[PDB]
Amino acid sequence: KERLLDELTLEGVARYMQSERCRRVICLVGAGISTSAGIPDFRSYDNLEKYHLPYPEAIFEISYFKKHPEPFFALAKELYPGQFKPTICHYFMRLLKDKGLLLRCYTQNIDTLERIAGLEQEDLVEAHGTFYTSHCVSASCRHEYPLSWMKEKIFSEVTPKCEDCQSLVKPDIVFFGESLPARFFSCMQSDFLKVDLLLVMGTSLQVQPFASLISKAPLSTPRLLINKEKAGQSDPFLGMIMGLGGGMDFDSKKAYRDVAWLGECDQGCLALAELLGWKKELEDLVRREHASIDAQS
């Protein structure tokens, strides 16, 4: 449609971010933006070997969870909010919020580091759920359990059983085979009508239907990929139908709006901030926030 970047580079994106058109930015973030916090990317020493799974992917599958929930809860104790501090990438999105640029952040992560970084719930679409709320597995029951109730069991190595029907209690985390929250679909419908820039950070786009989000962007909307490798160049598979289009296009002769920056997210965001002139503001924000987190202890 229209080319808005004068150059397909990080410098070209930065220069565009300072233009008058760049009003609304949407972020798609994956596991790569939390690795530098200490949270390993399980999709890429084996962190899962200790659980003796039939296969590493099983720990995130709903059918395996309902029979063998122990490995997940052991991992959940590690992933729990408070065990980690947000990264530079997280606080970069905080800067987007405070400057009024952040329309929405869609996240594949379940570490809630976005929330801790200062992003409010309205700013957030947690595509794969949250640990803040838990429900009973029984459809006849479906009793809701608070965060503190859930937190006590997980840190005490006790599988959370229901207090009514004695069934299993799982955090509202979206496992494979489970349906995504309603917010995801209602937000994706309206958010991508008015987005000026797509920031895809720390994801190889390996999980659906999250990966399909990139096809919802308008044809002229620039899309920047900050990831350890190139991704999203294949069929987005929107609606589980092929041929609809929307795949990333960095290297072809037809490329016009897709920019790939290869490396770690922290360095990617630092580089982008340096170009934008937010370098000092970003560094201060991180150190100040981390100090405030340690102040709670």
Binding site: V174, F176, G177, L180, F185, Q206, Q208, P209, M240
Partner: peptide
């Protein structure tokens, strides 16, 4: 095919 709303991997099948 009918499970778009379901969390999946990037396979072009069900």
């Amino acid at each position: 095919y009918h499970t778009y709303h379901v969390k999946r991997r990037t396979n072009y099948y069900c």
